[PDB]
Amino acid sequence: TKYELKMQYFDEWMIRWRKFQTESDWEIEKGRQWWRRFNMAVSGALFCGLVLYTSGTATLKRQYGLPHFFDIGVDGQAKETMLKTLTSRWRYTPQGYGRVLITGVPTYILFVTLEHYRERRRMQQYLQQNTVFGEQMRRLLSTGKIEEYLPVNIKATLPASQQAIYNY
Amino acid sequence: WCPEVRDRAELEVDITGWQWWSPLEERRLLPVRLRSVNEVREIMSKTQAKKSA
Amino acid sequence: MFLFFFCDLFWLRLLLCMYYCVWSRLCFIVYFNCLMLIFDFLLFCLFDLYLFVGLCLFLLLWFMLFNLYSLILYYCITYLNLYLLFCIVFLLYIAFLFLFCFLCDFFLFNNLLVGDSFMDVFFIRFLLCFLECFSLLCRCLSTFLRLFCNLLSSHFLLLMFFDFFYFIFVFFFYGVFCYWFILFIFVFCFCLLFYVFLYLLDLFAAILQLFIFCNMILQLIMDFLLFLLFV
Amino acid sequence: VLFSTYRSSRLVSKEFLHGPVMRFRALGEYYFQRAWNGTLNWALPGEYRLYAVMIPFIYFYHRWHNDHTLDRDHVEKAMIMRWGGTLEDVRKLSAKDQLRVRCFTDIEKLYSAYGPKDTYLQPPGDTLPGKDFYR
Amino acid sequence: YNMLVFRDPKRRPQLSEEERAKVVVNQAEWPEEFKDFDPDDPYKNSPEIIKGMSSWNLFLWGVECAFIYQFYELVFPKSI
Amino acid sequence: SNPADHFRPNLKALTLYAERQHYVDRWLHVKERWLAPWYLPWWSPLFQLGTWYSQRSRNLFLVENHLSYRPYKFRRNDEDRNNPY
Amino acid sequence: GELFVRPKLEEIPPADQCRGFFGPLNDSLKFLRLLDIKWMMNRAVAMRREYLIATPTLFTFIWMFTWKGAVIYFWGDRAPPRRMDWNTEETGRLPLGFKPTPAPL
Amino acid sequence: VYTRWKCDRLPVFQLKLFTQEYPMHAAVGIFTIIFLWKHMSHCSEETERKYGWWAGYPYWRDPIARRNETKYKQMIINNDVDITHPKWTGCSVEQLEELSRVV
Amino acid sequence: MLLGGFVPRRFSQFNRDPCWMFFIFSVGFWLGEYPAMMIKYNARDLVYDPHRYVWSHHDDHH
Amino acid sequence: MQGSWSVLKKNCSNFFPGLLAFAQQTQEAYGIWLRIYNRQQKYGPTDFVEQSETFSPDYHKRFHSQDKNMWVDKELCTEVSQKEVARLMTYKLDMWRMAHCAGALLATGGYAIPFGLFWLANDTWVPSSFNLTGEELRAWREAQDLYRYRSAPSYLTDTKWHFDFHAYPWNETQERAWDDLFEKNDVRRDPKVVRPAAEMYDGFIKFELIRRKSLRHLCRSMNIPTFPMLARLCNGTRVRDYWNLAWCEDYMVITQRLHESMTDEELYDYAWRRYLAPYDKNLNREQLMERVEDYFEFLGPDFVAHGKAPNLVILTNYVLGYYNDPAYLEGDISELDKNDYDHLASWGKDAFLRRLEFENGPLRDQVEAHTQRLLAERAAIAK
Numbered sequence A: 001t002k003y004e005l006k007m008q009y010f011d012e013w014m015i016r017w018r019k020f021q022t023e024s025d026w027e028i029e030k031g032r033q034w035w036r037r038f039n040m041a042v043s044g045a046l047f048c049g050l051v052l053y054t055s056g057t058a059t060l061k062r063q064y065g066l067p068h069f070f071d072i073g074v075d076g077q078a079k080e081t082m083l084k085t086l087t088s089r090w091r092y093t094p095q096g097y098g099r100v101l102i103t104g105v106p107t108y109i110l111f112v113t114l115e116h117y118r119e120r121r122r123m124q125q126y127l128q129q130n131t132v133f134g135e136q137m138r139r140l141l142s143t144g145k146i147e148e149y150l151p152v153n154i155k156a157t158l159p160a161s162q163q164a165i166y167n168y
Numbered sequence B: 001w002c003p004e005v006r007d008r009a010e011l012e013v014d015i016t017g018w019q020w021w022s023p024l025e026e027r028r029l030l031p032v033r034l035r036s037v038n039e040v041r042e043i044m045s046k047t048q049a050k051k052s053a
Numbered sequence C: 001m002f003l004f005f006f007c008d009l010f011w012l013r014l015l016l017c018m019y020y021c022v023w024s025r026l027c028f029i030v031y032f033n034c035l036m037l038i039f040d041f042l043l044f045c046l047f048d049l050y051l052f053v054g055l056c057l058f059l060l061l062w063f064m065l066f067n068l069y070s071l072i073l074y075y076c077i078t079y080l081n082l083y084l085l086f087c088i089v090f091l092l093y094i095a096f097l098f099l100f101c102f103l104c105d106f107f108l109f110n111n112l113l114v115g116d117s118f119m120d121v122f123f124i125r126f127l128l129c130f131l132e133c134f135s136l137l138c139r140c141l142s143t144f145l146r147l148f149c150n151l152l153s154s155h156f157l158l159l160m161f162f163d164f165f166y167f168i169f170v171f172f173f174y175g176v177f178c179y180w181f182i183l184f185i186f187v188f189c190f191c192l193l194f195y196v197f198l199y200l201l202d203l204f205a206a207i208l209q210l211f212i213f214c215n216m217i218l219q220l221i222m223d224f225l226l227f228l229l230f231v
Numbered sequence D: 001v002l003f004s005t006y007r008s009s010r011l012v013s014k015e016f017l018h019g020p021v022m023r024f025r026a027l028g029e030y031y032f033q034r035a036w037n038g039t040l041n042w043a044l045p046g047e048y049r050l051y052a053v054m055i056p057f058i059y060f061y062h063r064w065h066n067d068h069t070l071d072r073d074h075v076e077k078a079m080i081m082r083w084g085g086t087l088e089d090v091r092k093l094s095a096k097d098q099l100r101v102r103c104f105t106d107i108e109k110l111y112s113a114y115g116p117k118d119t120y121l122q123p124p125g126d127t128l129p130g131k132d133f134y135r
Numbered sequence E: 001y002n003m004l005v006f007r008d009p010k011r012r013p014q015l016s017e018e019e020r021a022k023v024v025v026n027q028a029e030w031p032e033e034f035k036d037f038d039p040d041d042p043y044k045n046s047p048e049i050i051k052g053m054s055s056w057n058l059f060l061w062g063v064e065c066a067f068i069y070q071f072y073e074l075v076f077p078k079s080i
Numbered sequence F: 001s002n003p004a005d006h007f008r009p010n011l012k013a014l015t016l017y018a019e020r021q022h023y024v025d026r027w028l029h030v031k032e033r034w035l036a037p038w039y040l041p042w043w044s045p046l047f048q049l050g051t052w053y054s055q056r057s058r059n060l061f062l063v064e065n066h067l068s069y070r071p072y073k074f075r076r077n078d079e080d081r082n083n084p085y
Numbered sequence G: 001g002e003l004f005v006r007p008k009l010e011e012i013p014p015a016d017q018c019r020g021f022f023g024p025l026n027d028s029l030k031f032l033r034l035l036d037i038k039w040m041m042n043r044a045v046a047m048r049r050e051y052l053i054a055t056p057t058l059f060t061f062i063w064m065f066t067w068k069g070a071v072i073y074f075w076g077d078r079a080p081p082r083r084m085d086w087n088t089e090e091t092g093r094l095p096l097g098f099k100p101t102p103a104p105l
Numbered sequence H: 001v002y003t004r005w006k007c008d009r010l011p012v013f014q015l016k017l018f019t020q021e022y023p024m025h026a027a028v029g030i031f032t033i034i035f036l037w038k039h040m041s042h043c044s045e046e047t048e049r050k051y052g053w054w055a056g057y058p059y060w061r062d063p064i065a066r067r068n069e070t071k072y073k074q075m076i077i078n079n080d081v082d083i084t085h086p087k088w089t090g091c092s093v094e095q096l097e098e099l100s101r102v103v
Numbered sequence I: 001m002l003l004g005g006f007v008p009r010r011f012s013q014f015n016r017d018p019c020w021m022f023f024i025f026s027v028g029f030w031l032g033e034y035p036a037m038m039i040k041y042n043a044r045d046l047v048y049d050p051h052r053y054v055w056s057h058h059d060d061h062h
Numbered sequence J: 001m002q003g004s005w006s007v008l009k010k011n012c013s014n015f016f017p018g019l020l021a022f023a024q025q026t027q028e029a030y031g032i033w034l035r036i037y038n039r040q041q042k043y044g045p046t047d048f049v050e051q052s053e054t055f056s057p058d059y060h061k062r063f064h065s066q067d068k069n070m071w072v073d074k075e076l077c078t079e080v081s082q083k084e085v086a087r088l089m090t091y092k093l094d095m096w097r098m099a100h101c102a103g104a105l106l107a108t109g110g111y112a113i114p115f116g117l118f119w120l121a122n123d124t125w126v127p128s129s130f131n132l133t134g135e136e137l138r139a140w141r142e143a144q145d146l147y148r149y150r151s152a153p154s155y156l157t158d159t160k161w162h163f164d165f166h167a168y169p170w171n172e173t174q175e176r177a178w179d180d181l182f183e184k185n186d187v188r189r190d191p192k193v194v195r196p197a198a199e200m201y202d203g204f205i206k207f208e209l210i211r212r213k214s215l216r217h218l219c220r221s222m223n224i225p226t227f228p229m230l231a232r233l234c235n236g237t238r239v240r241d242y243w244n245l246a247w248c249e250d251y252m253v254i255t256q257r258l259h260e261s262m263t264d265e266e267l268y269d270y271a272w273r274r275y276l277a278p279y280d281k282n283l284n285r286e287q288l289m290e291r292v293e294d295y296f297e298f299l300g301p302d303f304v305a306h307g308k309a310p311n312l313v314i315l316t317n318y319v320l321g322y323y324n325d326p327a328y329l330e331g332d333i334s335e336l337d338k339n340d341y342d343h344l345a346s347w348g349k350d351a352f353l354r355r356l357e358f359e360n361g362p363l364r365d366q367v368e369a370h371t372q373r374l375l376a377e378r379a380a381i382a383k
């Protein structure tokens, strides 16, 4: 299922009618942002791990060998530990397109899958909302079209000092 | 009717070789000329001596 | 908002088509230094240092078709806008800069930290590095600003002087028939001299500004070029 | 397979419009393909006659465009604002009156910043209409 | 010579004085266009492009064109 | 003023106007039409290129909580500094 | 200007010789090397790793001159006003008696 | 022999030039074009009146008002919009009729 | 680059080449438009517009 | 080669059989490569196995080093035969092109179908397995040779122009080697005369410093797909692997003299994989043997002695010189009797042209003498 094609219209409409954005929807969007950042972090960690695993033995020796910039002692211990751990077993160290594929395709797949499922989660969350945004989302998924000016049609709640327009 | 020159120039330009001066190759080839008869005699004598030894 | 307009080069495009349907040699170039970067033999560069030649030649042609012909009265410099020139210089300068940066050779920037180890790192060298990193962008901005301001000022001055000359020539030529004809003749001769001088100055300045515009970009490129020696 | 990427794939015969093309090339080559026609970056040729012919033509067509399309707008604005503020009011005048007004506009253009300012500043005591004449 | 910024090109001599002195000049073989040839006025005898059309005539033609351009509206004015 | 007016393009022919909402919506419709078919899986790089950046920008806009007021981009008058409305 | 050759392992001075803001962070003060920026700069200069100082700067400038500059200019949040228009959290809720459409099923 | 400039057609040479000769420049140009059309593609009516006309805005006919009138008429007619709806007017239809009878 | 070409020695030679003929025609236009403007814009019967003080560009650009 | 409908039909008909054959070849080549990789990892030098880093002296960019990152397995004949190596090389080419096509398909979903139609209409980028008959294989080889002809001259010109513009040879023998290296295939080049160019260019540029544009041209000339090129260290790795396999096979053949016992078609294929023998030349066994012996001689004794081949850039130029055909010249010499500027005859000569003809014509000496005498007289009168 392709949720982005449906959700783009809803996002544009919300930006156009952001005045009726309840704190719940704002929290939903903040959570979406946080999950995007988390997905970026985990994908970057996976990419770094794959890069390190496929790195050449001489490259690892140069990177995790002498000299030590700080020379505190913990730095050298950690570098030696990592170097021994990497160089103990045999590792597939491809070069060129092969390393590119190995390091990128898993990262891209992970990031895209996480983002797509988070988008589905956000669609569900907006469906479960009891606000005008949730009603708009449900109507969009029902009729397939975005109904603009909906908040004023169904007379969504307004501040006490702005209810004169509904006075009809 | 001088295809070699055409091809070389076109290829040099198509590979970002815009410059039209080659001082080094000219320096290598500028003093080339057909030898005189006496020079040919001397060269032949040198070759004969080399072959003999 | 979408405005449809045309450049003022259609006749010049027609002339280019007419006179360049057949090949012709080129021996005079405004900025010849883009072709000869290396002067000491046996020095060679693995970087594509000759990539700027085509852009240089095209920019020279475009700016010469516009600026030089602008001296003709009522000719329009269609591109004469500050931010448009900024966009052009941004394109060129930032493209070359990102070409150098995509190389992913951090040592290339070691020369940014000015001075030697004797100088204090934090209070002298780091400040100098900051100033130089700022100076790169300032050089870009100065290039585009200079190109804009030279043309603007030159054409303002030309318009004002031409207006004054028209005024005096039309509304005070009758003085030739009067007893104060000598004053009018002196003024007219001075105006002719000023006219000639201004035209010569503008002609020279346009070409010189194009030369400088290309030289700034070439200097940017040269600042990060490293030459190996043949052995 | 649909379209060729090579310029060698001809779409017409070699003799198509040969004569007119030869005439056009003769026009192009006669004055330009000469030793003394050394261009500066393809923009400034060495033949004097090229300048002598092209500068006047460029000036002529630019001036015609400016006079009949650009300054005409300013002239029309002046006529409209000074004689009713509407096009019909101007058309109510005769051709000679319009000519007089347009020539006065030309006078103003010629004076510019180097001339008397009574042409647009009303001296005190003047009996001519002011700015609120049509208001 | 010069006409504004346009300078008349001059052919560089190629013969030495000794060789030059031995040259025999025979203007009978020269074309009628170039006889008594003068470097300072080589086109004095050059034919006119149009017979009877003087430079002053063209100058006056341009002046008349300018006068028309400036005076036609005075005689045949048109409404806006 | 008059000398400054001489530095304008001299060959303006036509001007067209269009609201940002309208053409953005039309572009979204075209993008949906071309990205809808089944033979373009959602995990394809093309689909992500089409959708992810737009989604991220719109989410950033929605999450925005600014203490200041940003005047409407397409007001009738934006030249008065003392009237943001 | 000229070609750069990385120093050999034996040409790199020891860490103890490096100086901080006030003085060398020798034994009993090694863990302070992490926090002293000037000590790190001097160590990088000694180790010929000057790029660590120059690369972050230049890139930062670029990042400001290219992407963040305009982002701040066009979308940045200006200083808040004295009298603030806080949100009453009253808008958005559906009215009483409204029958929302059923969710997909 | 084969050369891109002499053998390939113009579109192919254009793609090759801007993909394998000057790709970074093309990328920067596209970026700048997008920026210009995203942030420098709007002109308010007041701005048009001030600077948008060669000789000045002709207030005696107000072409901007006519343009907007045509725009709104076309939108209303094509989209079948009831401009008498309470949201547009802020009052019920009966109140509108009462006002019409009053004035 | 101003390298060469036909160069008339004096005015009378401008008719020896079509290009210079057109050039001299253009010069005649250029120089003769000025006397025309003198005669037209300094005429006795020329009259300033009575409504010249009703409106001016100075108030418009101000 | 340009696409065509006949080739499109051929490839469409043989699409699925071609895929099946490619899968079988993939299994076989995976087995062969597993053997070779195990042998390399077990008996390879420490630098080769550990992938020692070689950085450029200007921008410190890592690239494969010919001496360290390339190793010739002299004892590979025990585990792997020559035919298996040739099969692996052919499969590597086919797999590269198939992988690029598959990447395009995965990237663009179902929108690559028309591009697939363009692909199947030309044999340039289709695998060899798509040909099920001799005529189809001949056409495919012709297309590959056409691509090589299209690409190689640019690479050769790039190398020669850069070196000649930025450097010159040290001694006369180097000059002769450099000049004779880039001769057209219509003449026979002596490998002994040409070899010193390898050391000279090693002095100028090694394989570790090869530029990205030159690499692109070389990969084009080797029928290696270049889009997306990406960094220079991917196609560089492909080139290194292919030439390492070729060098191993060459050492095997030289040691075992297999080429003498090799049959005509197999010999032609062996030369072709070295870019020595185009199929359109219709070479016989004598010419193939001569070219192969010249290639072995160019490799030099040091190749057998220590497994060290000459500079790879110069080797590639030398081998690709066989695809640098003489510049075409068509048309009878009688065509030179025509004229090119008849269309201008109607225009005649203007005053300036008449003056130039008069001054620089056969009467030039008389005019010069008259002018100089007149000028001298005028100067004397002035003084």
Ligand SMILES: CCCCCCCCCCCCCCCCCC(=O)OC[C@H](COP(=O)([O-])OCC(O)COP(=O)([O-])OC[C@@H](COC(=O)CCCCCCCCCCCCCCCCC)OC(=O)CCCCCCCCCCCCCCCCC)OC(=O)CCCCCCCCCCCCCCCCC
Binding pocket: A033, A036, A037, A038, A040, A041, A043, A044, A045, A048, A049, C098, C101, C102, C103, C104, F060, G059, G060, G062, G063, G066, G067, G068, G071
């Ligand atoms: C190679 C290229 C060379 C050539 C370069 C040429 C160009 C010149 C260079 C300069 C650039 C010029 C600019 C050109 C235009 C480019 C486009 C552009 O500018 O877009 C910016 C544009 C700016 O955003 P925006 O549109 O203005 O909107 C602003 C909003 O913030 C947007 O909101 P959002 O929702 O998108 O979120 C964005 C988020 C982005 O971040 C995230 O989403 C989360 C983090 C992502 C991490 C990614 C992976 C990193 C590695 C993971 C771990 C690996 C190791 C694993 C193993 C460990 C073993 C122990 O950032 C934030 O909002 C900030 C969050 C920070 C949280 C901090 C919390 C405090 C604790 C942590 C910090 C303090 C630690 C102290 C420790 C002290 C110890 C003593 O886009 C972004 O920056 C965000 C989107 C892209 C994110 C990419 C993330 C990866 C970045 C690369 C990392 C690796 C390379 C760098 C290191 C290399 C070392 C060798």
Ligand SMILES: CCCCCCCCCCCCCCCCCC(=O)OC[C@H](COP(=O)([O-])OCC(O)COP(=O)([O-])OC[C@@H](COC(=O)CCCCCCCCCCCCCCCCC)OC(=O)CCCCCCCCCCCCCCCCC)OC(=O)CCCCCCCCCCCCCCCCC
Binding pocket: A043, A048, A051, A094, A095, A096, A097, A099, A100, A103, A104, A105, A107, A108, A111, C104, F045, F046, F048, F049, F052, F053, G059, G063, J060, J061, J062, J063, J230, J231, J232, J233, J234
């Ligand atoms: C529609 C899809 C959209 C996709 C968008 C994403 C981007 C494009 C995707 C990929 C496109 C295909 C082509 C990519 C380039 C290929 C390059 C190449 O040929 O490499 C060959 C090369 C193979 O050759 P090799 O001989 O095996 O090894 C190379 C030699 O070592 C070479 O030896 P060497 O001598 O050259 O050694 C030097 C080498 C050494 O490096 C390597 O080669 C090693 C591999 C790279 C390591 C990178 C990680 C380094 C550590 C990062 C630590 C971060 C900590 C942060 C902590 C934060 C805590 C809060 O290079 C370096 O030193 C460069 C280091 C990187 C510097 C980064 C500077 C960034 C500045 C940022 C400025 C500010 C940005 C804005 C502001 C942001 C913040 C607000 O490949 C690699 O080594 C790795 C290739 C990886 C390719 C990229 C994979 C992409 C995955 C994407 C996943 C996410 C998708 C998101 C989709 C979103 C929706 C659409």
Ligand SMILES: CCCCCCCCCCCCCCCCCC(=O)OC[C@H](COP(=O)([O-])OCC(O)COP(=O)([O-])OC[C@@H](COC(=O)CCCCCCCCCCCCCCCCC)OC(=O)CCCCCCCCCCCCCCCCC)OC(=O)CCCCCCCCCCCCCCCCC
Binding pocket: C002, C003, C004, C005, C006, C007
């Ligand atoms: C609603 C009203 C209508 C308008 C609708 C507009 C819709 C707009 C949609 C929204 C667009 C938003 C974005 C707009 C941004 C604009 C930016 C801008 O203007 O920047 C300035 C910038 C100015 O650039 P420039 O430096 O002046 O150079 C561009 C020039 O085109 C010169 O550059 P170049 O010379 O390098 O170009 C190459 C040139 C190379 O040179 C040539 O090929 C020479 C010819 C040049 C033609 C182009 C110049 C046009 C000159 C003015 C118009 C000519 C007269 C037209 C007469 C119209 C009468 C009503 O070749 C061509 O131009 C190829 C086309 C040749 C056509 C030949 C046709 C032959 C037909 C023969 C038929 C025979 C039938 C026989 C039947 C017998 C039966 C018995 O403009 C551009 O760069 C192009 C902007 C275009 C943007 C796309 C617009 C959408 C497409 C609209 C097409 C409308 C077609 C229907 C019209 C129907 C009549 C009303």
Ligand SMILES: CCCCCCCCCCCCCCCCCC(=O)OC[C@H](COP(=O)([O-])OCC(O)COP(=O)([O-])OC[C@@H](COC(=O)CCCCCCCCCCCCCCCCC)OC(=O)CCCCCCCCCCCCCCCCC)OC(=O)CCCCCCCCCCCCCCCCC
Binding pocket: A094, A095, A096, A097, A098, A099, A100, A101, A102, A103, A104, A105, A106, A108, A109, A110, F043, F044, F045, J026, J029, J030, J033, J095, J096, J097, J098, J099, J100, J101, J102, J103, J104, J106, J107, J228, J234, J235, J237, J238, J241
């Ligand atoms: C569904 C998700 C999709 C995601 C989006 C994907 C978008 C498309 C991107 C391209 C993806 C790959 C396409 C298929 C390629 C075929 C497989 C392959 O690698 O072939 C080998 C071959 C390796 O090339 P090489 O130069 O020989 O490698 C040098 C190494 O030293 C070689 O090392 P060596 O010398 O030791 O030799 C080893 C050799 C020895 O073996 C042999 O000799 C036997 C043959 C083995 C290979 C057979 C290949 C057959 C290809 C044709 C297949 C049939 C096609 C049929 C088409 C018609 C169908 C109707 O075996 C290999 O070739 C192994 C190579 C390493 C494996 C690479 C695969 C990694 C990714 C797969 C795992 C993913 C896990 C995800 C986990 C998720 C967790 C959350 O691949 C290529 O030709 C390279 C690809 C060329 C196109 C590049 C296009 C740009 C790619 C940029 C990627 C950036 C990251 C992703 C984000 C993108 C954002 C813009």
Ligand SMILES: CCCCCCCCCCCCCCCCCC(=O)OC[C@H](COP(=O)([O-])OCC(O)COP(=O)([O-])OC[C@@H](COC(=O)CCCCCCCCCCCCCCCCC)OC(=O)CCCCCCCCCCCCCCCCC)OC(=O)CCCCCCCCCCCCCCCCC
Binding pocket: D001, D002, D003, D004, D005, H011, H012, H015, H016, H019, H027, J001, J002, J003, J100, J101, J102, J104, J105, J112, J113, J115, J116, J117, J118, J119, J120, J121, J122, J124, J125, J227
């Ligand atoms: C069922 C099958 C099996 C399953 C599938 C298997 C997988 C298949 C897929 C993989 C296949 C791979 C192999 C493909 C090989 C063939 C490739 C190819 O195309 O060859 C050229 C191929 C001919 O090849 P060939 O004859 O065999 O010669 C090959 C030679 O070896 C010549 O070789 P060459 O090397 O010299 O040629 C190479 C040439 C290839 O190119 C070409 O040759 C150009 C082709 C197009 C030419 C078009 C000319 C005609 C234009 C007409 C315009 C309209 C006219 C008016 C129409 C009016 C209609 C009413 O140049 C290039 O390679 C340039 C590459 C450029 C790459 C662009 C990358 C852009 C990246 C963007 C920047 C990103 C930066 C990072 C940003 C990161 C941000 C975070 O071209 C054609 O066949 C021309 C087709 C033209 C079609 C008609 C015109 C277009 C129609 C468009 C319709 C649109 C409809 C919708 C409109 C909607 C409007 C709203």
Ligand SMILES: CCCCCCCCCCCCCCCCCC(=O)OC[C@H](COP(=O)([O-])OCC(O)COP(=O)([O-])OC[C@@H](COC(=O)CCCCCCCCCCCCCCCCC)OC(=O)CCCCCCCCCCCCCCCCC)OC(=O)CCCCCCCCCCCCCCCCC
Binding pocket: F034, F045, F046, F049, H010, H011, H014, H015, H016, H018, H019, H020, H023, H024, H026, H027, J100, J101, J103, J104, J107, J108, J111, J125, J216, J225, J226, J227, J228, J229, J230
């Ligand atoms: C006079 C006016 C005429 C008209 C002019 C028209 C207006 C043009 C204006 C602008 C022109 C310049 C634009 C330049 C942009 C900047 C370029 C740049 O920075 O490039 C850097 C850089 C330069 O490339 P390069 O690899 O160094 O060498 C380029 C040479 O051309 C390689 O040359 P080579 O000789 O070394 O190799 C030759 C041969 C070598 O042979 C091979 O390599 C074997 C065959 C390989 C097949 C392809 C393998 C691909 C593998 C996967 C690649 C990664 C995918 C990433 C994920 C997907 C992202 C979408 O390769 C080929 O034959 C390539 C065939 C490609 C045919 C397609 C060309 C485009 C035609 C238009 C089709 C699309 C129209 C869309 C718009 C209309 C929609 C209705 O680009 C890359 O690194 C390539 C990245 C490619 C990523 C995928 C494409 C991303 C762009 C968006 C695609 C959207 C698809 C939409 C589908 C339909 C939707 C409805």
Ligand SMILES: CCCCCCCCCCCCO[C@@H]1O[C@H](CO)[C@@H](O[C@H]2O[C@H](CO)[C@@H](O)[C@H](O)[C@H]2O)[C@H](O)[C@H]1O
Binding pocket: A027, A030, A031, A032, A034, A042
């Ligand atoms: C491959 C990885 C798969 C992971 C699958 C899921 C793992 C288990 C759940 C992980 C933890 C989730 O818990 C997560 O906590 C953070 C707070 O820290 C919440 O985040 C909340 O508070 C933070 C506080 O800064 C706000 O910025 C954010 O807007 C708000 O939503 C997330 O809404 C919640 O989802």
